[PDB]
Amino acid sequence: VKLEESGGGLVQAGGSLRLSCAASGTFSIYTMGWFRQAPGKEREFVADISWNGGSTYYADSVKGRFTIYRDNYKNTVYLQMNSLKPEDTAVYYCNADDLMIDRDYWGQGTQVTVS
């Protein structure tokens, strides 16, 4: 299992960005999620989505501005970010928690910088 993140980069405050996390490489199923990491700080939960898409959870800092969703055809989970703020600047990581074997997997991380 490999997770490849795409999107990100430099964005003006008030803008929007969509991050993607494409899974590749069997077939268990997964809780997929997004975390972010500011320099010198704890890893911060952002959002996650259940294996069948029926339940989503968001950190209070992003509720009402961010949306997590899954496109099964592309085997990709997405993070739509609106009204971006300097406080959102971080490396964003997607995670996949294998519910059959209790092992999780991580993307390489993608920088989002809000100017």
Side-chain angles (χ1 to χ4, degrees), residues 1 3-25 28-102 104-115:
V1 177
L3 307 172
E4 185 60 18
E5 300 175 38
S6 290
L10 189 64
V11 55
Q12 299 164 287
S16 298
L17 274 180
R18 190 186 69 170
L19 302 185
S20 63
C21 171
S24 58
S28 192
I29 47 190
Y30 305 88
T31 301
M32 306 292 290
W34 292 94
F35 295 79
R36 63 187 183 184
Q37 181 74 68
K41 301 291 180 62
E42 80 301 331
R43 195 178 85 238
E44 181 182 17
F45 173 77
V46 179
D48 65 12
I49 184 163
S50 61
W51 62 276
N52 69 342
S55 301
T56 54
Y57 299 90
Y58 297 92
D60 283 336
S61 51
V62 310
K63 218 149 53 160
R65 295 188 292 138
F66 292 10
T67 301
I68 185 170
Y69 71 98
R70 193 181 306 213
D71 179 331
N72 298 343
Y73 177 84
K74 300 281 218 193
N75 210 10
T76 300
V77 61
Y78 296 91
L79 185 68
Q80 177 68 53
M81 298 181 292
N82 300 297
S83 193
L84 282 161
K85 310 163 177 178
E87 78 200 27
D88 298 311
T89 293
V91 173
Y92 283 71
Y93 294 90
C94 64
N95 176 72
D97 187 10
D98 186 320
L99 301 166
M100 298 299 100
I101 67 170
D102 194 21
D104 73 333
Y105 306 94
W106 292 93
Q108 84 287 352
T110 190
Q111 179 73 33
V112 173
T113 303
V114 187
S115 61

